[PDB]
Amino acid sequence: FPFVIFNEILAWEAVMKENYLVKINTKANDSSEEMVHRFRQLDAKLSDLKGLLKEISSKIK
Amino acid sequence: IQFGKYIRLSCETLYDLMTQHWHLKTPNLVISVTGGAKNFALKPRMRKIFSRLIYIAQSKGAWIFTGGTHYGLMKYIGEVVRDNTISENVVAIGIAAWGMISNRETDGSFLLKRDPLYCLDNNHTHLLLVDNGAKVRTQLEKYISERVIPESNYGGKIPIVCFAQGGGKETLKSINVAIKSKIPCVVVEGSGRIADVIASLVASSCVKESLLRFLPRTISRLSEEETESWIKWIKEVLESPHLLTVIKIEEAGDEIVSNAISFALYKAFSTNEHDRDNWNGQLKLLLEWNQLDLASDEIFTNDRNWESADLQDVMFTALVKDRPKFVRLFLENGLNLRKFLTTEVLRELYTNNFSSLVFKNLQIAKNSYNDALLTFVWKMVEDFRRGRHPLQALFIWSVLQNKKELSKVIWEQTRGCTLAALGASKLLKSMAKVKNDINAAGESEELANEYETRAVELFTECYSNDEDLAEQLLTYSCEAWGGSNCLELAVEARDQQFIAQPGVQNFLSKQWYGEISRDTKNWKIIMCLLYYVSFFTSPFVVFSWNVIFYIAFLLLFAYVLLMDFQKEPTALEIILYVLVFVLLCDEVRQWYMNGSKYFSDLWNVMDTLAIFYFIAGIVFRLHSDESSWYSGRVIFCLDYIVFTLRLIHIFTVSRNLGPKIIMLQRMMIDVFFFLFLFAVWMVAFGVARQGILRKNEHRWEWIFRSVIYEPYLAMFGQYPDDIDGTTYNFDRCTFSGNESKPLCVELDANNQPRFPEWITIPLVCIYMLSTNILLVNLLVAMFGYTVGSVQENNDQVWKFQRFFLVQEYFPFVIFNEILAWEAVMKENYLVKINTKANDSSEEMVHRFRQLDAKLSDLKGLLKEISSKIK
Amino acid sequence: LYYVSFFTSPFVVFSWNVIFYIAFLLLFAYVLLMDFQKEPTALEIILYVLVFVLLCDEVRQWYMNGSKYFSDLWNVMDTLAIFYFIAGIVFRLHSDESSWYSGRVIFCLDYIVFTLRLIHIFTVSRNLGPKIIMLQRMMIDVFFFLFLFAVWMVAFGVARQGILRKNEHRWEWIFRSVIY
Amino acid sequence: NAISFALYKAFSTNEHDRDNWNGQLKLLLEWNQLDLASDEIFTNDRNWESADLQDVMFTALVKDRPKFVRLFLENGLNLRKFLTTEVLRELYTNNFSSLV
Amino acid sequence: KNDINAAGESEELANEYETRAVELFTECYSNDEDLAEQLLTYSCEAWGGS
Ligand SMILES: CC(C)CCC[C@@H](C)[C@H]1CC[C@H]2[C@@H]3CC=C4C[C@@H](OC(=O)CCC(=O)O)CC[C@]4(C)[C@H]3CC[C@]12C
Ligand SMILES: CC(C)CCC[C@@H](C)[C@H]1CC[C@H]2[C@@H]3CC=C4C[C@@H](OC(=O)CCC(=O)O)CC[C@]4(C)[C@H]3CC[C@]12C
Ligand SMILES: CC(C)CCC[C@@H](C)[C@H]1CC[C@H]2[C@@H]3CC=C4C[C@@H](OC(=O)CCC(=O)O)CC[C@]4(C)[C@H]3CC[C@]12C
Ligand SMILES: CC(C)CCC[C@@H](C)[C@H]1CC[C@H]2[C@@H]3CC=C4C[C@@H](OC(=O)CCC(=O)O)CC[C@]4(C)[C@H]3CC[C@]12C
Ligand SMILES: CC(C)CCC[C@@H](C)[C@H]1CC[C@H]2[C@@H]3CC=C4C[C@@H](OC(=O)CCC(=O)O)CC[C@]4(C)[C@H]3CC[C@]12C
Ligand SMILES: [Ca+2]
Ligand SMILES: [Ca+2]
């Protein structure tokens, strides 16, 4: 006891860190617990429906 | 080149260069049409898609054709290719245009501050430079798609996918000449200029209603004669939508690339008009990719052309390539698993695809932990390796290799699924105990705790129906799949949740009370202590008449030891020699009802040395010498403790003492910490207490009477009774070394006690503070946390060892419809599993999909009425 | 050289520093009780070597760190363990029983400080380990208890002297009856 | 989101500042309108070089525009090239607050 | 500590980047652990001291 006294690893992280930063900046979008964004996507065609009937209203008259 | 290889081409033999001199032939080819994007919005969704794309391309070993320059997506493609190649292989060939390269040289190294030219990308290892004064790239698309590979399930043809995301004329032209060529499988995305136009369109004026919301600032720079030509291209692009696939913004899920690549590769495979008859190739194509919902809807939902007899070669490759949802799809559409699992198919499953890393891990278990079911499977796995309920043999194959989702599929096809959910938990707990890995160990224990909870909810559903039918399942060997029944198989694997459940606990209480009508009262049976003889058949009474025999054994062993035990062994002392032989014979029987798990029990060691010290007591007694006859009585006295402390372990059945005695075996780490602190404090104080006395001999053992023993009595209250001052040399001490009194305080010429007494008095008062208060009262808190923490676990532990005490069952003692009932109830269980994923239904986003299915039908019906008025 | 590579892991280097330390305390025990004559005997000098080893091992902890070594609390106690030991050799080598006995008392009081290092050495053991660090959280519960006990001792002990009455009381018969 | 949208809609339609994407970016940087700066300025690949994106980057750091620092890096900006020895000197002497 | 809300928020962000490094390393360790354990020994081109 007194004798005691007297490349590939970086590339491996770069793939896995990239999948981490991807997983962060989309999980705010993968929250998605409200269909109020999908509610916005519904009424995008209801203006197109009434406008297409307004365009056919000029063709009969 | 230095910043790879390059070549300056001119507008077939290109492919002869890239393969015979350069790298390997490919089973895939993904092409990202861009390159003019010196500026590119690398959004996290566009970053997600092209990072999962190259990971997909590395599983198959593709080439990737990009723009080749150092900006935008091609810089990002090369960065993800380079990191994936270092950590099959992806080659990222760039195809640039040689008039747009900045610093042309003619092993040449490559290197103005606002140049409109392009820097070459560093991480494209092979570059193609087209000379002039897009064409040869699309011709290289058409040649590789016509290149015939015989070892493929695509019909050959080297599956080519084109990824369109950007905009401009240079890609809009490159989608037409893609689609004009056969099999481009162009895939568009919902982010970009042109790729957002073609995504929205899936009339000549209706096209220009789009592409001005998406490309408003390039048509104002365009002539009127060219915007009809731009409309003319998107006319031809939208002509064949079976080569166009969209990755929508709303599908921001997982595997959105492989659900877009394989959908594009299937849409250009089902429309060749000679492979539409070939449903086999479309199934093997849909099996490499994980597209299950396309393989069900497009292949199996017509009843068109199959026999469920050539569904076997696609089944064998669905097992070994880990397709758990496709094993389930082949069994839903008709596949006899007891006929598919021949003796040859299991031989090809146990020799080749059974990984030898698992088989060497079972070679570890042949010496480390020798069990009874492990030696049952070793003959079976080495039966086929040396080349019967075979469906459970496939279940063994899938649970050993930790295939979690596949084993849940094969579990639902067994005939005892109530049984095999425990035997899988036994095999998995063996492998999770042989620890050479950490995440593989931490997941194999997880799946062992899935199949244990799977067997728990099975049995509570079994028990909430007819319980005598449910209790009859626990006794079946079940055509000898395992060694033992469903009840003992949870015991060998220590499935404590399965025995703490109220079905088994009510079963064991019925088996312990025996023929006695259960729940009379516990008092009335003791008041009752060939119908009179059948009372004395229940193991509750056989237990009680082994306690009464044991207490009367101890009362005889008491009376022999105190009033009897003369020089020769008297009359009653011989009856004690008979009663220890009975307890010796009862431990011979426990060496006969078990081989070596009897020795694995701790308390079945203590009762052997209880007999071993007793038979040593008869040896020291029969010597007729008081130098040895008295030491015979001392061994019999010390043996009385070991026999009386067996009355603790006998009363672990009592439902009141029972949990508390097993609770007592959890305090032994709180005690051994307390004894460690107390022994160090005893030696530190007891040796420093000898700054009072001073001599050289001290008997070698007057030290331990004063250094160890006298501070030991201070814990129960002794407090240095008359050595710590104003107690002179009147008695208790010798000055000499005789007699056995502890020797005197060191003195002076004044014959005064030399010890300073301002040091020894606060030394004792510190020690009496610590070990009597700052230590024992600490032990209560560490006891008090233990009963707070392990109490809900001790109930499961006591209910677990409650089985062995019922399993154990006076010298006269020593010397069809049930399967049909489970088949209905198991069928309602497997129905309830595979629809509860659909009965989750907590989001109306599926109903949101059902809403807009008619809004296209509404606007289209108004488009159809628009032609009738005009 | 496979037998020697067993003795390279720090688990064994820890164990052979415990066995050395326990045998240091067993020698320090046997010197303090049966030995320790007027001149320092044969075995007593081997104790002077073993305290120099623990002095050199604290020099090394003053060399693997500069001042975070002193920021540790338990790396202060083992320095005054050596400092009271080297003070013990000073009071011993005087050849005067007025001072030679007080050399043995310092060596006796030093035996507590060296034995209470065996508490801090066994904070690795995964069983005693959490509980010894748990023991350093009770010192605010104890110092509250000692505060309540000392105020109750003085309030009762002084009011216990509506029994006796004198004027001198040695200045220290009070503490034998009011506190002790 | 209503003031800056109104100020942008009357800035992109002057027919002499529609060529000036630099002024429409500095306008959209004072207000925190990120989704308008992405969709209306960066989603055409119309006219920038990612070399005069540096003066708008330096004012996106010192005026605490965290979502616009992210927007300039998504659309191409070499941060190891933008952070010269001079830019860090102008970041450690002036905008590095001396209370810190 | 000369402020209170600035102190109570600077300790919060220190506990964000600590939990950010924890979920990084559990993702590092659930992959190849000898690769993950080799990260803990790198000076990493001498950014910090240790
Ligand atoms: C000199 C020696 C050999 C005589 C032995 C004396 C005791 C060791 C024996 C005789 C009386 C026994 C007890 C008599 C009554 C029972 C109640 C029994 O608890 C229950 O029955 C639970 C239900 C209930 O509350 O009644 C558990 C064992 C116990 C305590 C026995 C424990 C061991 C005892 C104390
Ligand atoms: C002079 C001597 C021989 C007479 C002493 C009488 C005992 C030897 C008898 C009378 C009460 C008996 C006990 C009464 C009931 C208990 C609890 C019983 O455990 C139970 O699970 C039933 C009680 C419950 O479940 O609440 C096991 C037997 C036991 C220990 C019996 C063991 C033997 C006992 C102690
Ligand atoms: C903090 C509390 C909870 C702990 C209580 C500590 C006391 C139990 C100890 C600490 C100091 C001790 C005293 C310190 C030294 C003296 C003198 C001693 O007599 C002499 O040494 C004579 C010296 C002289 O006067 O010349 C007798 C014991 C006595 C009273 C001790 C009595 C008990 C005391 C008060
Ligand atoms: C006169 C003096 C100097 C002699 C010293 C006697 C004790 C201070 C020593 C000798 C025996 C030692 C113990 C022997 C065995 C171990 C077990 C060890 O615990 C474990 O190994 C945990 C794993 C397990 O349960 O085995 C912790 C230290 C401990 C208690 C030691 C603590 C200190 C002890 C009591
Ligand atoms: C006459 C004297 C010299 C003989 C006394 C024997 C002890 C000096 C030896 C035998 C048991 C040893 C101990 C056995 C195992 C422990 C626990 C070990 O801590 C662990 O983490 C391993 C145990 C675990 O992780 O459960 C550290 C060393 C230690 C204290 C060892 C220290 C030295 C000990 C006490
Ligand atoms: Ca037994
Ligand atoms: Ca130290």
Side-chain angles (χ1 to χ4, degrees), chain E residues 5 8 12-13 15 17 21 23-25 29 38 45 50:
Chain E
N5 312 129
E12 184 44 64
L13 191 58
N15 300 325
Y17 285 158
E23 315 166 309
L24 261 173
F25 194 77
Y29 211 70
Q38 268 160 90
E45 302 165 352
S50 205

PDB file of all heavy atoms in Angstrom, chain E residues 5 8 12-13 15 17 21 23-25 29 38 45 50:
ATOM      1  N   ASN E   5     -36.371  37.760  -7.913  1.00  0.00           N
ATOM      2  CA  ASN E   5     -36.990  37.171  -9.096  1.00  0.00           C
ATOM      3  C   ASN E   5     -35.952  36.828 -10.153  1.00  0.00           C
ATOM      4  O   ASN E   5     -36.121  35.850 -10.887  1.00  0.00           O
ATOM      5  CB  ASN E   5     -38.043  38.113  -9.672  1.00  0.00           C
ATOM      6  CG  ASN E   5     -38.979  38.652  -8.615  1.00  0.00           C
ATOM      7  OD1 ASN E   5     -39.190  39.859  -8.514  1.00  0.00           O
ATOM      8  ND2 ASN E   5     -39.546  37.756  -7.816  1.00  0.00           N
ATOM      9  N   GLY E   8     -34.498  33.685  -8.646  1.00  0.00           N
ATOM     10  CA  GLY E   8     -35.432  32.577  -8.735  1.00  0.00           C
ATOM     11  C   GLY E   8     -35.710  32.107 -10.146  1.00  0.00           C
ATOM     12  O   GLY E   8     -36.272  31.022 -10.326  1.00  0.00           O
ATOM     13  N   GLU E  12     -34.008  28.562 -12.130  1.00  0.00           N
ATOM     14  CA  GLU E  12     -34.960  27.768 -12.894  1.00  0.00           C
ATOM     15  C   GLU E  12     -34.355  27.318 -14.213  1.00  0.00           C
ATOM     16  O   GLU E  12     -34.448  26.142 -14.577  1.00  0.00           O
ATOM     17  CB  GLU E  12     -36.238  28.566 -13.136  1.00  0.00           C
ATOM     18  CG  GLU E  12     -37.314  27.777 -13.852  1.00  0.00           C
ATOM     19  CD  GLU E  12     -37.462  26.373 -13.303  1.00  0.00           C
ATOM     20  OE1 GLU E  12     -37.834  26.227 -12.122  1.00  0.00           O
ATOM     21  OE2 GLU E  12     -37.205  25.411 -14.056  1.00  0.00           O
ATOM     22  N   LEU E  13     -33.706  28.240 -14.928  1.00  0.00           N
ATOM     23  CA  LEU E  13     -33.057  27.899 -16.189  1.00  0.00           C
ATOM     24  C   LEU E  13     -31.874  26.962 -15.978  1.00  0.00           C
ATOM     25  O   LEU E  13     -31.558  26.156 -16.860  1.00  0.00           O
ATOM     26  CB  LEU E  13     -32.618  29.176 -16.903  1.00  0.00           C
ATOM     27  CG  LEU E  13     -32.145  29.038 -18.349  1.00  0.00           C
ATOM     28  CD1 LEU E  13     -33.233  28.430 -19.208  1.00  0.00           C
ATOM     29  CD2 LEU E  13     -31.698  30.377 -18.893  1.00  0.00           C
ATOM     30  N   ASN E  15     -32.090  24.610 -13.839  1.00  0.00           N
ATOM     31  CA  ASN E  15     -32.789  23.344 -13.704  1.00  0.00           C
ATOM     32  C   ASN E  15     -33.518  22.941 -14.976  1.00  0.00           C
ATOM     33  O   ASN E  15     -34.053  21.830 -15.037  1.00  0.00           O
ATOM     34  CB  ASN E  15     -33.774  23.406 -12.536  1.00  0.00           C
ATOM     35  CG  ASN E  15     -33.086  23.686 -11.215  1.00  0.00           C
ATOM     36  OD1 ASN E  15     -31.964  23.240 -10.981  1.00  0.00           O
ATOM     37  ND2 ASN E  15     -33.753  24.434 -10.346  1.00  0.00           N
ATOM     38  N   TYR E  17     -31.694  23.284 -18.061  1.00  0.00           N
ATOM     39  CA  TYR E  17     -30.559  22.699 -18.758  1.00  0.00           C
ATOM     40  C   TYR E  17     -29.999  21.484 -18.047  1.00  0.00           C
ATOM     41  O   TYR E  17     -29.264  20.709 -18.663  1.00  0.00           O
ATOM     42  CB  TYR E  17     -29.471  23.748 -18.940  1.00  0.00           C
ATOM     43  CG  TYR E  17     -29.799  24.742 -20.014  1.00  0.00           C
ATOM     44  CD1 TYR E  17     -29.205  25.990 -20.035  1.00  0.00           C
ATOM     45  CD2 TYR E  17     -30.728  24.439 -20.998  1.00  0.00           C
ATOM     46  CE1 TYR E  17     -29.510  26.895 -21.014  1.00  0.00           C
ATOM     47  CE2 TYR E  17     -31.039  25.333 -21.972  1.00  0.00           C
ATOM     48  CZ  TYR E  17     -30.429  26.555 -21.976  1.00  0.00           C
ATOM     49  OH  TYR E  17     -30.758  27.439 -22.958  1.00  0.00           O
ATOM     50  N   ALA E  21     -29.983  17.959 -20.044  1.00  0.00           N
ATOM     51  CA  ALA E  21     -28.852  17.049 -20.125  1.00  0.00           C
ATOM     52  C   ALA E  21     -29.179  15.660 -19.603  1.00  0.00           C
ATOM     53  O   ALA E  21     -28.491  14.702 -19.963  1.00  0.00           O
ATOM     54  CB  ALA E  21     -27.660  17.611 -19.355  1.00  0.00           C
ATOM     55  N   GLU E  23     -32.253  13.977 -19.995  1.00  0.00           N
ATOM     56  CA  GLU E  23     -32.934  13.260 -21.066  1.00  0.00           C
ATOM     57  C   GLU E  23     -32.057  13.069 -22.290  1.00  0.00           C
ATOM     58  O   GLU E  23     -32.333  12.180 -23.096  1.00  0.00           O
ATOM     59  CB  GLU E  23     -34.217  13.979 -21.470  1.00  0.00           C
ATOM     60  CG  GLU E  23     -35.056  14.449 -20.310  1.00  0.00           C
ATOM     61  CD  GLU E  23     -36.127  15.430 -20.733  1.00  0.00           C
ATOM     62  OE1 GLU E  23     -35.794  16.411 -21.433  1.00  0.00           O
ATOM     63  OE2 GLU E  23     -37.303  15.223 -20.369  1.00  0.00           O
ATOM     64  N   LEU E  24     -31.015  13.879 -22.453  1.00  0.00           N
ATOM     65  CA  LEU E  24     -30.036  13.598 -23.491  1.00  0.00           C
ATOM     66  C   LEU E  24     -29.249  12.338 -23.175  1.00  0.00           C
ATOM     67  O   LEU E  24     -29.035  11.500 -24.055  1.00  0.00           O
ATOM     68  CB  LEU E  24     -29.088  14.773 -23.656  1.00  0.00           C
ATOM     69  CG  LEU E  24     -29.393  15.715 -24.803  1.00  0.00           C
ATOM     70  CD1 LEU E  24     -28.462  16.882 -24.710  1.00  0.00           C
ATOM     71  CD2 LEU E  24     -29.197  14.980 -26.108  1.00  0.00           C
ATOM     72  N   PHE E  25     -28.821  12.183 -21.926  1.00  0.00           N
ATOM     73  CA  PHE E  25     -27.959  11.060 -21.600  1.00  0.00           C
ATOM     74  C   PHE E  25     -28.722   9.754 -21.482  1.00  0.00           C
ATOM     75  O   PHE E  25     -28.158   8.700 -21.784  1.00  0.00           O
ATOM     76  CB  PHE E  25     -27.194  11.318 -20.311  1.00  0.00           C
ATOM     77  CG  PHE E  25     -26.067  10.365 -20.101  1.00  0.00           C
ATOM     78  CD1 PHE E  25     -24.883  10.519 -20.793  1.00  0.00           C
ATOM     79  CD2 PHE E  25     -26.199   9.297 -19.234  1.00  0.00           C
ATOM     80  CE1 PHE E  25     -23.847   9.636 -20.612  1.00  0.00           C
ATOM     81  CE2 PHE E  25     -25.165   8.410 -19.052  1.00  0.00           C
ATOM     82  CZ  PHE E  25     -23.990   8.579 -19.741  1.00  0.00           C
ATOM     83  N   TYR E  29     -27.733   6.661 -23.403  1.00  0.00           N
ATOM     84  CA  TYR E  29     -27.454   5.392 -22.747  1.00  0.00           C
ATOM     85  C   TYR E  29     -28.368   4.267 -23.205  1.00  0.00           C
ATOM     86  O   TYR E  29     -27.986   3.100 -23.090  1.00  0.00           O
ATOM     87  CB  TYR E  29     -27.571   5.546 -21.233  1.00  0.00           C
ATOM     88  CG  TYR E  29     -26.668   4.631 -20.459  1.00  0.00           C
ATOM     89  CD1 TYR E  29     -25.295   4.821 -20.462  1.00  0.00           C
ATOM     90  CD2 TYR E  29     -27.185   3.582 -19.717  1.00  0.00           C
ATOM     91  CE1 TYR E  29     -24.462   3.989 -19.753  1.00  0.00           C
ATOM     92  CE2 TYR E  29     -26.361   2.746 -19.004  1.00  0.00           C
ATOM     93  CZ  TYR E  29     -25.001   2.954 -19.027  1.00  0.00           C
ATOM     94  OH  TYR E  29     -24.170   2.121 -18.318  1.00  0.00           O
ATOM     95  N   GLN E  38     -18.297   6.741 -23.161  1.00  0.00           N
ATOM     96  CA  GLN E  38     -17.106   7.396 -23.674  1.00  0.00           C
ATOM     97  C   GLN E  38     -17.284   8.896 -23.818  1.00  0.00           C
ATOM     98  O   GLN E  38     -16.286   9.615 -23.923  1.00  0.00           O
ATOM     99  CB  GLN E  38     -16.715   6.796 -25.019  1.00  0.00           C
ATOM    100  CG  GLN E  38     -15.742   5.653 -24.903  1.00  0.00           C
ATOM    101  CD  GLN E  38     -15.737   4.787 -26.132  1.00  0.00           C
ATOM    102  OE1 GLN E  38     -14.975   5.023 -27.069  1.00  0.00           O
ATOM    103  NE2 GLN E  38     -16.593   3.776 -26.143  1.00  0.00           N
ATOM    104  N   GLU E  45     -12.476  19.092 -27.139  1.00  0.00           N
ATOM    105  CA  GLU E  45     -11.669  20.157 -27.749  1.00  0.00           C
ATOM    106  C   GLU E  45     -11.412  21.318 -26.789  1.00  0.00           C
ATOM    107  O   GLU E  45     -11.200  22.452 -27.228  1.00  0.00           O
ATOM    108  CB  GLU E  45     -12.304  20.659 -29.049  1.00  0.00           C
ATOM    109  CG  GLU E  45     -12.502  19.577 -30.089  1.00  0.00           C
ATOM    110  CD  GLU E  45     -13.437  20.008 -31.197  1.00  0.00           C
ATOM    111  OE1 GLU E  45     -14.037  21.095 -31.074  1.00  0.00           O
ATOM    112  OE2 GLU E  45     -13.574  19.261 -32.186  1.00  0.00           O
ATOM    113  N   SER E  50     -12.985  20.660 -17.622  1.00  0.00           N
ATOM    114  CA  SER E  50     -13.072  19.231 -17.395  1.00  0.00           C
ATOM    115  C   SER E  50     -14.082  18.593 -18.347  1.00  0.00           C
ATOM    116  O   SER E  50     -14.649  19.245 -19.225  1.00  0.00           O
ATOM    117  CB  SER E  50     -13.441  18.963 -15.937  1.00  0.00           C
ATOM    118  OG  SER E  50     -12.995  17.686 -15.528  1.00  0.00           O
TER     119      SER E  50
END
